[PDB]
Design a protein around this ligand. Structure first.
Ligand code: HEM
Length: 121
């Protein structure tokens, strides 16, 4: 397995404006290559707020996500999202629950890699 950091920004549905969702993922993320497979590895902040998250490519095919680590004390979670070299944009669909502000909403956003996912090595 080899990796490189990658810059990205989550943007609002139907807009190029930065999404609130961008604030809850750590920057930069990471691209990982292992055994002919690529992953975008990213850390969700305040993971307990994220009741559901699903990721899709530009062809609206759901991308497999796995938990790398779930850190309850820090309230973070590292996940891998299956990707391929050349991916530029992911659609995400999330259900966010913040009980202390009576907040319970579902959203779609698009995550924009700064550059296409590169071919590593
Ligand atoms: C306690 C923390 C939070 C506050 C105060 C908050 C506040 C808001 C507000 C006020 C809006 C409506 C649009 C606006 O007025 O700007 C909004 C929408 C939205 N929020 Fe939350 N939010 C919180 C947590 C989160 C989390 C944890 C996520 C996802 C990880 C999230 C994702 C979104 C998304 C995707 C929208 C739709 C517009 C956009 O894409 O930015 N929010 N939020």
């Amino acid at each position: 397995a080899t990796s490189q950091p990658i810059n990205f920004q989550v943007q609002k549905d139907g807009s190029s404006e930065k999404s609130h969702m961008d604030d809850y993922m750590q920057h930069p993320g990471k691209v990982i290559k292992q055994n002919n497979k690529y992953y975008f590895q990213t850390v969700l902040n305040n993971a307990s707020f994220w009741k559901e998250y699903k990721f899709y490519n530009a062809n609206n095919q759901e991308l497999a996500t796995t938990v790398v680590n779930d850190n309850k004390k820090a309230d973070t979670r590292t996940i891998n999202v299956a990707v391929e070299p050349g991916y530029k944009s992911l659609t995400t669909k999330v259900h966010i629950v913040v009980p202390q502000i009576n907040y319970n909403h579902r959203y779609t956003t698009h995550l924009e890699f700064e550059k296409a996912i590169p071919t590593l090595a």
